[PDB]
Design a protein around this nucleic acid. Structure first.
Ligand SMILES: CO[C@H]1C[C@H](O[C@H]2[C@H](C)[C@@H](O[C@@H]3O[C@H](C)C[C@H](N(C)C)[C@H]3OC(C)=O)[C@@H](C)C[C@@]3(CO3)C(=O)[C@H](C)[C@@H](OC(C)=O)[C@@H](C)[C@@H](C)OC(=O)[C@@H]2C)O[C@@H](C)[C@@H]1OC(C)=O
Ligand SMILES: [Cl-]
Ligand SMILES: [Cl-]
Ligand SMILES: [K+]
Ligand SMILES: [Mg+2]
Ligand SMILES: [Mg+2]
Ligand SMILES: [Mg+2]
Ligand SMILES: [Mg+2]
Ligand SMILES: [Mg+2]
Ligand SMILES: [Mg+2]
Ligand SMILES: [Mg+2]
Ligand SMILES: [Mg+2]
Ligand SMILES: [Mg+2]
Ligand SMILES: [Mg+2]
Ligand SMILES: [Mg+2]
Ligand SMILES: [Mg+2]
Ligand SMILES: [Mg+2]
Ligand SMILES: [Mg+2]
Ligand SMILES: [Mg+2]
Ligand SMILES: [Mg+2]
Ligand SMILES: [Mg+2]
Ligand SMILES: [Mg+2]
Ligand SMILES: [Mg+2]
Ligand SMILES: [Mg+2]
Ligand SMILES: [Mg+2]
Ligand SMILES: [Mg+2]
Ligand code: NA
Ligand code: NA
Ligand code: NA
Ligand code: NA
Ligand code: NA
Ligand code: NA
Ligand code: NA
Ligand code: NA
Ligand code: NA
Ligand code: NA
Ligand code: NA
Ligand code: NA
Ligand code: NA
Ligand code: NA
Ligand code: NA
Ligand code: NA
Ligand SMILES: [Sr+2]
Ligand SMILES: [Sr+2]
Ligand SMILES: [Sr+2]
Ligand SMILES: [Sr+2]
Ligand SMILES: [Sr+2]
Ligand SMILES: [Sr+2]
Ligand SMILES: [Sr+2]
Ligand SMILES: [Sr+2]
Ligand SMILES: [Sr+2]
Ligand SMILES: [Sr+2]
Ligand SMILES: [Sr+2]
Ligand SMILES: [Sr+2]
Ligand SMILES: [Sr+2]
Ligand SMILES: [Sr+2]
Ligand SMILES: [Sr+2]
Ligand SMILES: [Sr+2]
Ligand SMILES: [Sr+2]
Ligand SMILES: [Sr+2]
Ligand SMILES: [Sr+2]
Ligand SMILES: [Sr+2]
Ligand SMILES: [Sr+2]
Ligand SMILES: [Sr+2]
Ligand SMILES: [Sr+2]
Ligand SMILES: [Sr+2]
Ligand SMILES: [Sr+2]
Ligand SMILES: [Sr+2]
Ligand SMILES: [Sr+2]
Ligand SMILES: [Sr+2]
Ligand SMILES: [Sr+2]
Ligand SMILES: [Sr+2]
Ligand SMILES: [Sr+2]
Ligand SMILES: [Sr+2]
Ligand SMILES: [Sr+2]
Ligand SMILES: [Sr+2]
Lengths: 337, 53, 132
RNA sequence: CGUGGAAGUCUGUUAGAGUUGGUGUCCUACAAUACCCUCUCGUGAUCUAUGUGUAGGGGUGAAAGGCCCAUCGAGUCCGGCA
RNA sequence: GCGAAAGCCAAGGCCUGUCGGGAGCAACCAACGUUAGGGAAUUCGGCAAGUUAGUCCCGUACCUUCGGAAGAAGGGAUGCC
RNA sequence: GGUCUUAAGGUAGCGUAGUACCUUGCCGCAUCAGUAGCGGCUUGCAUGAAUGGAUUAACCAGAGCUUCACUGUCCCAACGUUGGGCCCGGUGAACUGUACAUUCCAGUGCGGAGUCUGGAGACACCCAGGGGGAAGCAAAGACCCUAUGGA
RNA sequence: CGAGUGGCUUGCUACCUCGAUGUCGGUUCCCUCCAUCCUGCCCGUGCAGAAGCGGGCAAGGGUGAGGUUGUUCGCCUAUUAAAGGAGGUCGUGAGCUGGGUUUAGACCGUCGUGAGACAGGUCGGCUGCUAUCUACUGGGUGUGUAGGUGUCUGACAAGAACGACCGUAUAGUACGAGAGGAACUACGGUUGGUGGCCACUGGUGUACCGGUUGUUCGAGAGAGCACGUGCCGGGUAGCCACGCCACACGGGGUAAGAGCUGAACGCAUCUAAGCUCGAAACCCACUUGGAAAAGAGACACCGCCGAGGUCCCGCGUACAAGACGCGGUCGAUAGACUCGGGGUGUGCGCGUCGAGGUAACGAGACGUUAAGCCCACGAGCACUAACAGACCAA
C-alpha cells in the first residue's frame, strides 16, 4: 500500500541560496535580566582537538569521573565597540534614530568603513535621551568590529563589522553602560560577556559546497537495484504528479549547498583562556598556530577554518549552567596521522 | 596507557581495544598497528616499533 | 531502558547469523526482531550490543532447533564508544538466550561479555565468566 | 600392466562459425540491425572462397509462413491505369 | 607457457580508429576501482557483480544404458638459492 | 441401473499435471513466516497408451525450487579513476513552428483551458539543471466497429 | 423500515479523444482529504486498580521490516506507541522496471470435419526524442527606487524542527480479600526526523612509501608496460558516516469538555449578555529568506573633482560562466629554501656471515641506518612573483 516516510530534508532552512553577508546576522536576542552587558562576542574558527573533563552534571551517574569531550578551538581576540546605535518604536516596527561614535579608531578600520572625521557625539546622545523622555526609545545596540590583525593565521586585516545588542537593567542604566564602553575606546573581551561553563548560540556561514545534487543536498535515495544501471543514478523519480501542471518548490532539486547562515543552539563553552595550550603539533591543518585569546566550544561549529563565527548567550537553554568545568587534559597531538 | 603492540604512549581519547576469543584484551594506538598485527607480524621484528628500538 | 554508558553502532541486522554464548544446546542464532525498535522505510531493522533481540535457533540440538526465543546481544564485531573515547571491538557477534524475566536460560556463559551489558541485564552479568 | 589412439567425445576468444544475458552503450547512430562485457560450437549433419543449378502461385525451406539483392501469408520493374 | 593463449619486446608500420585550448576539472551521465559491520534483508528472479581458478599428490556420493556420474565433493602442495 | 445414446465404455500406468475450474485443495517436508518447490493423497471442471503412456543414465546460453560459498543487489551510501559535461578558438546540422503567449488558483466550456469568466501573482534579459504541464514531439490506431473493401 | 452523504468498487450511459491523451503491478518524489490506527486534550462504562470497551475534539507528527504470489487485494511472521484508510488522468514510462494482460514461435487440456478458437494453463518474446514555451531549483546581468561605504529595519514568506518511545525515583506505594498494580513530578537513555561538523572511530585516498610476478632497457643500479594502480601491504590532507555536536520551556486565544455568575421562566439552568479554564491542533516564541514592500524603507559617515568602484596582479574561507571573499612592499598573498608536523618502514654502496661449491658462484642475514624516499599542512623567511598601470564616477 506504499509505506509512509518523512520528506527528504527540511523546508525550514529555505531558500537554499548563497548568504548575503559572510558575517552572520542574529535575528533573535536574549531577555533583559541582570546587570547591563553586550549580548554577544565573536572570533575566528581555528580547528578541533579533544579535551578531558570531569562530569559536572548532578543527574549523571558518572558525576566526577573522567570524560572525553570533542572541542572546537576559536581564536577570540578583543573587539572594539565603535558606536552606540539607538532605535525608536514607530508604527512600522523599529527604526534607527541616531548613532554615537568615537575619536579612537583602529589603524586599519578604513579598509571597510569611511571612518568619521567630523561627528557630534553630544547632539546624538541628546536625541536619544529626549526620545527616552517621550517613551519612544526601542532597544540599545552597539556597532562592533573585529581585529583580524591580532590573529596571525587569518589572512584578512579588513575588519568584520556587525551590530550587537545591549540588554540588562533599566533602559536608562543600559544607555549609560553602553555610552560608557564606547567613550573609552570600545575595547572588550570574551571575559566581559561570557564565563566558561555557560551555554551560547554560535552563528556561522557554512562550508561552501558549490552546486550539488539531490542525494547530497536533500538526502534523497540513489536509484536502487536494476534502476541504478539504466542511466539514472542520482536523479529522483519524478518532479511531481500530472496535476498540478507545475513543479512545486517542495520537490528536491539541485543547486547551491553550503555558504548558508546557521545559528547552532546551546553550545557549551568548555574553557576561555589565553596562550598556546590548545594548539596542535605542526599547526592546525589549513589554519596555523594558536597563541593568544581563545575559546573552546563543545562539539561542532558551522563554517571552515579562518571563518568568522558569532556568539550570543542562549535564548533557549535546556540545562542550568554548571560553571568553570575542570579540565584534566587538552590534546596537542598532531591532526596529521 | 601504552600500546600492546608498538609500545608508544596511546594519546588519551584515542585508540581501539580489541577483545580476543578467550577473553584477552589488546589495546591499540592506531589502525597501522592493528593491520600489522592482522598480517601476523610481531612487533619485535619491525624496526619502526618502540619494542624493537 | 537504562543507559548503557556507551555509544553503540549497531553491527547486526534482521536475519543475521550470530553465536550463542551459553550451554543451552543452541549453537547458532538468527535475529528476527529487536525489542522496542521502530525503523523507517527501506531500512533493515538494526541490532547491537545491549539490545534485547528476538531470535530463532538455526543450529544446535534437535530439541532447541527451530524455537523462537528471546536473547541479549553480548558481543559484536563493530566498535562501540566508551565515555573515555576509546573504541571496543570483539572477535565475534554473540548473544545469550534469555527467558521472560531477563534471566539466562542456560547455566554457563561461554566467552567474554561487555561491562555495559551488566547495567541492563544483571543476572546475565552475575553468570558471566569474564567481563571486559 | 603396457601398447593403441577411437569419438556427429570433452576444455579451449588457435583459425573460424554462432548469438544467451546485460533487456548495458547507441537509438536525428559509427551503423536503415552498430559497440562493449558475458555466452555457444570449435574432426564434423563442421566452417569457407570461387564456379555452377533451381524463378514468382513458381524456387528453396532439419518447417520459423523462413528465405529468393534493406522488398515476401506470394519478389521486382513497367504496363493494364487517369 | 601446454599453446597459433595472456602479458612484455623485436623486424616492419604508425602517432590519420585525425579538431583543439582552459577550470583539482561542480551537478549530472558513461565505463570502472575500493568500501567498515551485516550478507540476498534487494528483485518477478542473485538481474548485475562477485566467488572459484593453473599444475601435482591424496581422495571422491546417489544414480547408471557399466560408457558415465567425475575436475563430483573434500584435503594437502606450489617461490627463490 | 444391479441397459441407453452412438461402435465401445478408460485396461498398464500417470494424476491438483506446462493438463485441475473450484484452489493458496488436504497432510507432511522446509522457513520466524513459503499462492512457491518437493512427497503423499487424489473422486481426473476437462489424464492415458506410436493423437504414443510410464520411465529414464548421459547432454542443455531450456522452465521452477533448496543449500554451502560469494558479494555495494540491499541496509546506505562515500571517496576515487578515465571520457564527457562547464568556459574559450574553429567547424556547424536537425526535430519542431495557426497566431498570441510572465503565469497561478478556481470556475466555465463538446464533460481533460497559458488565451473564456473571476480573482491572485507578475520589472526585463541571460546561464546551469532535472524533465511537472503544453491531454509535449514522433506514425491519417496495429485494439473495436463500419465498408454490399483486400488478401 | 425509513432519510441521506460520498464518488474508493461494480454496473449503466455512450457526452470527449480512434490524422493515438502509452497498460496493470511495483518503484521513486511531491502535495492533499478525514470517515482518526498511534500520539494530545476529553466524555461514558457492565469505570476498584491494572488492562479494556464505546464515544467527542483533533490531520502537528507518525503509521515501519519481512515469507508465498506479477499481483492490487489478501494470507502468514516477528517486532511496534500504531504498524489507518483515501485523492492527485485508478498522481508519477519526454523518471525507472517490464513480472502480468495483449502481437508474431511452441506445448497441454477442451471445442471444431477443418483453417482454427478459448474472458483456460504454460515457456519465449523490443521500451524512441539534442526541450521552443511554460513550471520549479539554484546562478547572473540590467533597469526602477534617485553619489558612495558600512550597519540595519521587516511588509510578507518557509519550517515538524521536532515527533515518539523505554527505563529509574515516585512504588511494590494509591486501589484491591488476593492476584495484581497506576499517576503528578523529577530525572536517564533510545528511535525517527532535522541542521551542522571531522578532535575521535571508520571509509576513500589510480598523492605517497614498501613487497613482489612477467617482460624490456646487457647484469647492477634505475626505470617503462601489464587500462587507464600489474598485483599485494600501509596510508597523509580533503571529502565523508558507519563517526561527533545541537534541535525547550513558557506565554495568548480556542475545540471537545469541566465550571462560575446569570436571565428569559420568582425556581432551576455552563449561555442567551458576561466570565474562569481547557488539545500533539492555532497564534507568539525559535530558525531561514526577505528593499522590487511602486508607501520601492531607516541610520551613521564619506564624497560631488573627487568618495567609492571596475579592469589589473598574487590568491581562495568562494566558485560550472557570471558571482563572492582576501591580499597587493606601509606586504607574509603564492612559490623556492629551512625548520616543524606527518606517510612509509630501514636506501645505493661497502664490511661481516651465508647452505654449499675446487673455484667460479651464492638466495639470504647483520651492521652502517628511527635509515632512504615522500607530503595537497604549519612556521620562519621579502629571495622570487603581487609590478606597471588603465578606466568609470555625482
Ligand atoms: C508499445 O510498444 C511500442 C514499442 C516501440 O515504441 C516505439 C515508438 C515509441 C512507437 O510509438 C508508439 O507506437 C505505439 C503503437 C502507439 C504509441 N502511442 C499510443 C503513444 C506510440 O507512442 C508511445 C508508445 O509512446 C512507434 C510507433 C513510433 C513510430 C513513429 O511511429 C515509429 O515507428 C518509429 C520509426 C520508431 O520505430 C519503430 C519500429 O517504432 C523509431 C523512432 C524507434 C527508434 O522508436 C521506437 O522503436 C519506440 C520504442 O515500438 C512500437 C511499434 C510499439 O507499439 C506497440 C503497440 O507495441
Ligand atoms: Cl529507484
Ligand atoms: Cl522485524
Ligand atoms: K484515443
Ligand atoms: Mg586527521
Ligand atoms: Mg590517529
Ligand atoms: Mg520497499
Ligand atoms: Mg554457392
Ligand atoms: Mg503460424
Ligand atoms: Mg560491506
Ligand atoms: Mg548472472
Ligand atoms: Mg502439488
Ligand atoms: Mg491404440
Ligand atoms: Mg504525455
Ligand atoms: Mg485511421
Ligand atoms: Mg485486428
Ligand atoms: Mg476476401
Ligand atoms: Mg469527525
Ligand atoms: Mg497533514
Ligand atoms: Mg520484498
Ligand atoms: Mg495511473
Ligand atoms: Mg510524464
Ligand atoms: Mg527522454
Ligand atoms: Mg511469467
Ligand atoms: Mg509469459
Ligand atoms: Mg518508452
Ligand atoms: Na539512458
Ligand atoms: Na504521465
Ligand atoms: Na551478443
Ligand atoms: Na507471384
Ligand atoms: Na545445443
Ligand atoms: Na561499486
Ligand atoms: Na517538462
Ligand atoms: Na449521493
Ligand atoms: Na463510475
Ligand atoms: Na505503474
Ligand atoms: Na494528524
Ligand atoms: Na506480500
Ligand atoms: Na493517463
Ligand atoms: Na518505457
Ligand atoms: Na508504468
Ligand atoms: Na494554551
Ligand atoms: Sr496511491
Ligand atoms: Sr544582526
Ligand atoms: Sr527576522
Ligand atoms: Sr531499458
Ligand atoms: Sr490543468
Ligand atoms: Sr564434436
Ligand atoms: Sr531479453
Ligand atoms: Sr536499434
Ligand atoms: Sr556489463
Ligand atoms: Sr568447446
Ligand atoms: Sr500504374
Ligand atoms: Sr619499432
Ligand atoms: Sr583533420
Ligand atoms: Sr587501498
Ligand atoms: Sr532471495
Ligand atoms: Sr582443492
Ligand atoms: Sr479408472
Ligand atoms: Sr516420451
Ligand atoms: Sr536538460
Ligand atoms: Sr498503420
Ligand atoms: Sr486516541
Ligand atoms: Sr524475497
Ligand atoms: Sr484494482
Ligand atoms: Sr485472492
Ligand atoms: Sr512482460
Ligand atoms: Sr487466456
Ligand atoms: Sr492466471
Ligand atoms: Sr519605467
Ligand atoms: Sr513505573
Ligand atoms: Sr507481586
Ligand atoms: Sr499492601
Ligand atoms: Sr598505467
Ligand atoms: Sr463550552
Ligand atoms: Sr530600494
Amino acid at each position: 500500500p506504499q509505506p509512509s516516510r518523512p520528506r527528504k530534508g527540511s523546508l525550514g532552512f529555505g531558500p537554499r541560496k548563497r548568504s548575503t553577508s559572510e558575517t552572520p546576522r542574529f535575528n533573535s536576542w536574549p531577555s533583559d535580566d541582570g546587570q547591563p552587558g553586550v549580548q554577544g562576542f565573536a572570533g575566528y574558527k581555528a580547528g578541533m582537538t579533544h579535551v578531558v573533563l570531569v562530569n559536572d552534571e548532578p543527574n549523571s551517574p558518572r558525576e566526577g569521573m573522567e570524560e572525553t569531550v570533542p572541542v572546537t578551538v576559536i581564536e577570540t581576540p578583543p573587539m572594539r565597540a565603535v558606536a552606540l546605535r539607538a532605535y525608536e518604536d514607530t508604527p512600522y516596527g523599529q527604526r534607527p534614530l541616531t548613532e554615537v561614535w568615537t575619536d579612537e579608531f583602529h589603524s586599519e578600520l578604513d579598509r571597510t568603513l569611511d571612518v568619521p572625521e567630523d561627528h557630534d557625539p553630544d547632539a546624538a546622545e541628546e536625541q536619544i535621551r529626549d526620545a527616552h523622555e517621550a517613551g519612544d526609545l526601542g532597544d540599545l545596540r552597539l556597532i562592533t568590529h573585529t581585529v583580524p590583525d591580532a590573529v596571525p593565521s587569518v589572512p584578512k586585516k579588513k575588519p568584520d563589522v556587525m551590530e550587537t545588542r545591549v540588554g540588562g537593567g533599566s533602559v536608562s542604566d543600559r544607555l549609560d553602560h553602553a555610552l560608557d564602553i564606547v567613550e573609552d575606546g570600545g575595547e572588550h573581551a570574551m571575559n566581559d560577556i561570557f564565563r566558561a561553563g555557560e551555554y551560547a548560540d554560535v552563528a556561522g556561514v557554512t562550508k561552501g559546497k558549490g552546486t550539488q545534487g539531490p542525494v547530497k543536498r536533500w538526502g534523497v535515495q540513489k536509484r536502487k537495484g536494476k534502476h541504478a544501471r539504466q542511466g539514472w543514478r542520482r536523479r529522483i523519480g519524478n518532479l511531481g504528479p500530472w496535476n498540478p501542471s507545475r513543479v512545486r518548490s517542495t520537490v528536491p532539486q539541485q543547486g547551491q549547498t553550503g555558504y548558508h547562515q546557521r545559528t547552532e543552539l546551546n553550545k557549551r563553552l568548555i574553557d576561555i583562556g589565553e596562550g598556546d595550550e590548545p594548539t596542535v603539533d605542526g599547526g592546525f591543518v589549513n589554519y596555523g598556530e594558536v597563541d593568544g585569546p581563545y575559546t573552546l566550544v563543545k562539539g561542532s561549529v558551522p563554517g571552515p577554518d579562518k571563518r568568522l563565527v558569532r556568539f550570543r548567550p542562549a535564548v533557549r537553554p535546556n540545562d542550568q549552567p554548571r560553571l568553570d568545568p575542570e579540565v584534566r587534559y587538552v590534546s596537542n597531538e598532531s591532526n596529521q596521522g | 596507557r601504552e600500546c600492546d603492540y608498538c609500545g608508544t604512549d596511546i594519546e588519551p581519547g584515542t585508540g581501539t581495544m580489541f577483545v580476543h576469543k578467550d577473553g584477552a584484551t589488546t589495546h591499540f594506538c592506531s589502525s597501522k598497528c592493528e593491520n600489522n598485527a592482522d598480517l601476523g607480524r610481531e612487533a619485535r621484528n619491525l624496526e619502526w616499533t618502540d619494542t624493537a628500538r | 531502558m537504562e543507559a548503557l554508558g556507551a555509544d553503540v553502532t549497531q553491527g547486526l541486522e534482521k536475519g543475521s547469523l550470530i553465536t550463542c554464548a551459553d550451554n543451552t544446546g543452541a549453537r547458532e542464532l538468527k535475529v528476527i526482531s529487536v525489542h522496542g525498535y521502530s525503523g523507517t522505510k527501506n531500512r533493515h531493522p538494526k541490532a547491537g550490543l545491549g539490545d534485547k533481540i528476538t531470535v530463532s535457533v538455526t543450529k544446535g540440538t534437535p530439541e532447541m532447533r527451530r524455537q523462537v526465543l528471546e536473547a541479549v546481544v553480548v558481543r559484536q564485531r563493530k566498535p562501540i564508544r566508551r565515555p573515555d573515547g576509546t573504541r571496543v571491538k570483539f572477535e565475534d557477534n554473540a548473544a545469550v538466550i534469555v527467558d521472560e524475566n531477563e534471566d539466562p536460560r542456560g547455566t554457563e556463559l561461554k566467552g567474554p561479555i561487555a561491562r555495559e551489558v551488566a547495567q541492563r541485564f544483571g543476572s546475565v552479568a552475575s553468570a558471566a565468566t569474564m567481563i571486559v
